[PDB]
RNA sequence: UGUACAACGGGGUAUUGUAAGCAGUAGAGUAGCCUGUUGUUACGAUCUGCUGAGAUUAAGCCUUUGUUGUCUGAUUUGU
RNA sequence: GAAUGUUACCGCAAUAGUAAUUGAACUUAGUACGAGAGGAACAGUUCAUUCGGAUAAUUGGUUUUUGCGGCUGUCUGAUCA
RNA sequence: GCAGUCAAGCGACAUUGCUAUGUCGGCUCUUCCUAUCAUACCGAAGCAGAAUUCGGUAA
RNA sequence: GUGAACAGCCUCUAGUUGAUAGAAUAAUGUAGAUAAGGGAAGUCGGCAAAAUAGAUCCGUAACUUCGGGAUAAGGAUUGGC
C-alpha cells in the first residue's frame, strides 16, 4: 500500500481512487479526483490556483518550510524492520503530526494577527459616518 | 565464495540429500495449492518476530 | 552449465537475475525453477522470492552485483522491505528514480566494469557506481542500445548478441577488461542478455540452449 | 492466448476495436499499424473484434517504409490510451495507443522498443520486456 | 427459415415471470442439507444494507498470478444487529409437503413484532397477545403440551426471529418477522435449544465467521414500467423508425396466430427476488468494538462507516458483516443472509480473507480523507476556529 | 402525549472557488496644482490582506442536550 | 380486484419455466511415446470468451441542484444585486 | 444413358467401352427438426506419440 | 443599444397576458442536446448529426474563351485597460 500526493493539489490519493496519466517522458502523475485530472489537461497552472495547496505554498497562507517536515521523505534505502523501531516510529509520527498542528496553528495566529484592529477601524468609520441612523435608533 | 566450492553438488538421486523445498511442495499439496510463506527466509537478530507484521 | 526452464518460458534471465553473492527468481508459478538454483546454489547463497512492481520479469527490471542491488520507482515498499530483509548486509539496496525503470536491460554490469544506456543521467550514473563500486561508460554493442538485454558479463568473461562486429567485439572486451564471445543462445536466440543469468561459477539457460551454445557459454565463462 | 504468452491475461477495457490505427514502438521503419483483427477473441454477432493492452493483433503497416506496407504480420499492443483497471488500484491510461509488430513466436522484429511500455504487456510478454527500455 | 444467424436469446428464461415480488423481505426457498451429526445452529440471519465500500486485500491465492500481490476490491456492508427468538414453528412431513403442525410463541414480545400485526398501530388498542400471555401461565402445561406435541411429530424445526429495528438508524421501527430452519442435533435437541432462548437474543459471530461463505437472498431495485431495449437489452433500432424505435419490432410468425410468451415484451423492471451464491465474508464487526474499520495494517481507530455517514443510511453502531462483491437489493433493505448451502471445497472458500486497509472516504462525494483529524491535519486551522 | 412526528436552527460530510466593502510605498500608462528629478493630487483593466474566503447542502446525505407547532378528521367489517 | 365469518402474520407446494456455456495458463512433464523430428493422459490448481442475474465500492458518462464561478448583447441612473 | 455380358428366381446382385425471364434481400425477434460443423461419451482405422478419417446415441 | 446591415437579441412610445387546465415525470414518442477509446468498421448508399462560419494579414495551383477559378487550397491574430 502507498498514499500518493496529488500532482496539483498533493493531497493523499488513497489506492483505488483518482486517475492517473503516464506520458511519453516515462513519469506519471496522479490526480485524486476528477477535478484536478479536467484542471490538468486544460494546461492550468497549480500555482496560480488557489484552491490548491501549491498557491497556499507559494502565497505564504501557510507554513511552507518547517523542522517536521524533513521527517517525510522517500526512503530509497530500506530499514530491516526492528521490532522496537516500528514502536518508535509509531510514536514519534503521532508526537510529529502534534508538534506540526501547533507550529501551524501558530503560523495561521501569526498570520492572522491584527485583523481586529482593522474591524475595529471599520466600525469606527461606520458609526462616525451615520449619525442619522443612530440617532433615530434611540 | 568459499561456501560454494565446500558445498557438495546436488545428488541426482538420493533420500539423504537436500530437501529442495520443490519436494516440500509436493508432499503438502502441490504445485498447484501449495502456499510458500516468503517469511521464514530473510535474516534477522531475532527469529522471534520473524512472523510479525510491519 | 545446467539447463532449467520458467514455467514455459525458456528467457531464464526474464524472470531471474543471478549473481556472485545472491539470486532472485520470480514468485509466480510453482518452485520448480526455486529448486533449479538449489541444486546448484543450495544455501551457500540467499535465494529470495521476489516480485518487482508486481511483474515477474524482475530479472530485467533490476540490476546490480554482489556489492549492490537496484530496483526502479515502480517497486512498492513492501517489495523494497523484503529484499533488504532477505539479504545480507554486504548487498546494498538503492532505490532509483530514472526515467528509464528498466535497470535490467538499460544496466549491464560485472562486478568491476558497468556499462548504461546513454540516455541515463550522470546522477543516476554516479549512484550505480558508487552503490556497485564499478567503473561506468556509456557504451552500445553495434548499435543495440539495450546492453542488459544483448549483453551478459561477468568476471570470467562475457557474451554477447551474434550481430555484434569484429570492431565492436574488440572495443567491448577492451572497455570491460573481459574475454568477450559473439553467439546466440536457447537455439539462436539473440538476446542473449535475457535469455540466460550467468555469475562467475554458474550459468544458467534455458532449454533451447543446444550443446554448441552450452560448450560456448562453459568456454568463455570459465565454468570448466 | 497465443504463442509467446507465459500467463493468464487480465480483464481490461477493449480500447482498439478493428480498424484502429495505433502508432509504432519499434525500430523497424513503421510508423502506424492497421487492425484488421484481434487473436483470441471470440466473435460474436454485430460485435467488432477488440484489443487491449498486451494483446496480440494482426495488422498491415499503412506509414513508414514501404516494404512493410500491403503485408499483414502479428502485433502486439503496447500503449492502450484508454483507463484500464489496474489490479494495484489505479485507474491509469496513456497518452497514445501504440503497438509493435513480432513474429508469432514473439520475437521482437526490432531490436529495441522506444516510450514506455504498458506493465500488462511487458510482464506477459518476456520479448517486448527485454526488447522495452522502460516499463509503465 | 433459418434467419442465416444465430444468436443467444435475450434474457434468461428461467427468471419468469418478470413480476413484482410479493413482499420485500425474500423467503428463503431451500436450507442446507440438515445434517443432525453437528451441534444445534441457525441456518440464515436477517440484516439490512449499509452501502458499500473497497477494500485491499494480500492475496494468497496459489497459482494465480496475483500470488502474495495487493489487489482492490469492493466489499458490501450490511448491518446485522443481534436477533431474538420469538416463537418456533413444528413442521410435520405429509404426502402432499411438509406441513406446519403448530406455532408456539413466547412468553412476552416486544413492541417491533406487535407493530407488524397492525397497519394502523397508533389507532390500535395493542391486543396483541392479551389471552396468549394469559394462557402461558397459571399452569405452565398448555405451551408445554404444544412443545411435547412438536417434539413427537415434528421433522424440521424453524425458529422466529425479527430484527432489533429500533437498534437501526432506519425509521422504520418495524421489524421482520422470518422462519429460520434449525441445523444439528435431533429435532428434541432443536426445540430444546430454542426454547432456552425463548425473549433472548442470538449474536452473529456464533453463526457465521470470517472466511465463511454465503448466499445474499432479497429483493432487487425497482424501476418500474421499463422499455424492452433496458429490459431484456434488446438492440436500438437504426433511426427515427416508423411507430417507435426503443421496442422489439417483429413480435411473432403469422403461424401460430398468437404472441410467443418468450418474445421479451416490455414490462416490470425490477424489484425481483434474486438468489446468490458463493459470497466470501471479508470481515465480522462489532457495535461494542471501537476500530471497526481497523486492521492490523492500518493501526487507525477508526469505525467503518464513512465519514458523515453512508448515503441514505444512518450509521452502523452495532454488528455488522462484510461481504466481497455485491448483494441484490438497495441500501436500507432487508436482506437475508443463508449458508452456501451445499459443502463447498473450493479454494476460494478455504481462502484466509486478512484486510490489508479499509476504506472510510465520505461516501457523498469525491472524498479525500479517511477520518475528520486527517481532514484537520491536511486543511488546517479555518476561519471558523477563531 | 413520548429515544413520538413535522418546519427551522447548530454541527459532520461534500460542490464550487477567494464574495460585498475597506486600505495598499503593487499597478503599463495619461491629466489639475506645482518647480520635482520616489513632487503631489486625479483616472487606472488587474493584483495584494481581511479571505481555502463567500454561496448551496437534500428535493432520495448523517446527526440533532435548541426554538415553534401537531397528536380522536369520515367509512366499513360478525363463526 | 368482489366473493372464501373479518383483518393480519408466518408457511407447504399442485403446476409452468429453467442455464450456464466454451477455450486457454501452472503442475503432471519435455514425463510415457519416439531411432530422430517432436510429443502427450488423468487428478490437482489459475484465468479468460459468449450468455444470464445483480450493484455504485473505485473510474467513465449526464446537468434543471440552473449548486458554485467566469463570458457577450441588452435593461434597472452607477456599485452591489 | 446407349449397345452388350452370365443367371438365383420369375430378371436382383455383380459385369464390358465414354460421359436460367424470375423478382427476393436485410435489421430486429421467438420457436422447432437432425440429415452432428463445434462441445460430452464410445468403436473401427499403420492410433508408436502428436495430428487425422469414418462410424453410434446424443439439438 | 449591440452589430456592415430593416441579419440575430434586449429596451422606450404603442398594443397584448389570448392557445382548457390541477398532480407525477412510467415505458414509447415529438422538439433540442451531452458522451471515455476506435473514427464509417453501420447502412442499398457519409441518410441524419457533426465539423469551417464574421473581420485583419501572408499566400493561393491545374485549366481558361484571359473576363474567371478565388473567400481556391493552407496558414498567424481576435477580450479588457
Redesign the interface.
Known sequence: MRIYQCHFCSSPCY??????????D?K?F?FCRSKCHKAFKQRRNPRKLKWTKAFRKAAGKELAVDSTLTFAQRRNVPVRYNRELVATTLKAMARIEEIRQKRERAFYKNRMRGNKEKDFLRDKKLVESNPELLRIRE | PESVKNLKKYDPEDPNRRKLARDIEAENGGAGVFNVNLKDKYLLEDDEWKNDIM | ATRTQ????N?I???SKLTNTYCLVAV?GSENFYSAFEAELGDAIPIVHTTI?????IG??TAGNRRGLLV?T?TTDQELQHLRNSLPDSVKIQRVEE????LG??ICCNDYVALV?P?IDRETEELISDVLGVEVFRQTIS????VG??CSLSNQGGLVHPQTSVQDQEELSSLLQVPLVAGTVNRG?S?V??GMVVNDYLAVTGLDTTAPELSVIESIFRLQ | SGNGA???KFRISLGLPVGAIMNCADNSGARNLYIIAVKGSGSR??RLPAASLGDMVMATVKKGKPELRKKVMPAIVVRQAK?WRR??????????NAGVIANPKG?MKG??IT??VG?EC??LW??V???????? | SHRK?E?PRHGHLGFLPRKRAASIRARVKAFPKDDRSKPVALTSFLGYKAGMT?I?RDLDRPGS??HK????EAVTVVDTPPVVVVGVVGYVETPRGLRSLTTVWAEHLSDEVKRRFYKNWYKSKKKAFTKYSAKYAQDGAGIERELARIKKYASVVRVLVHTQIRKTPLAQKKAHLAEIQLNGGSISEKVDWAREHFEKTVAVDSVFEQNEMIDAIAVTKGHGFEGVTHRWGT?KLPRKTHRGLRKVACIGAWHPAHVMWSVARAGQRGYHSRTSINHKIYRVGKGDDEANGATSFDRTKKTITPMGGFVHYGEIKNDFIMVKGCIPGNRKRIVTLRKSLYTNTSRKALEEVSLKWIDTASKFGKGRFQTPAEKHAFMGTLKKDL
Do not use: W
Open positions: 489506492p483505488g481512487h483518482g486517475i492517473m496519466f503516464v506520458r511519453n516515462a506519471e496522479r | 520458467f514455467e514455459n518460458s528467457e534471465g526474464v524472470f509466480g512492481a508486481g511483474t515477474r520479469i530485467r527490471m526502479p515502480q526515467r528509464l525503470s528498466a536491460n538499460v544506456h540516455d548499435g543495440n542500445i539495450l538485454s544483448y536466440s538476446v542478455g535475457a | 507465459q500467463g493468464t454477432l454485430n483507463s489490479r494495484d488500484g489505479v485507474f491509469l491510461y496513456f497518452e497514445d520475437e531490436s529495441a516510450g514506455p506493465k511487458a510482464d518476456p520479448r520486456a527485454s526488447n522495452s527500455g522502460v516499463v509503465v | 444467424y444468436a473497497t485491499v498470478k496475483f500481490r495487493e489487489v482492490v438492440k
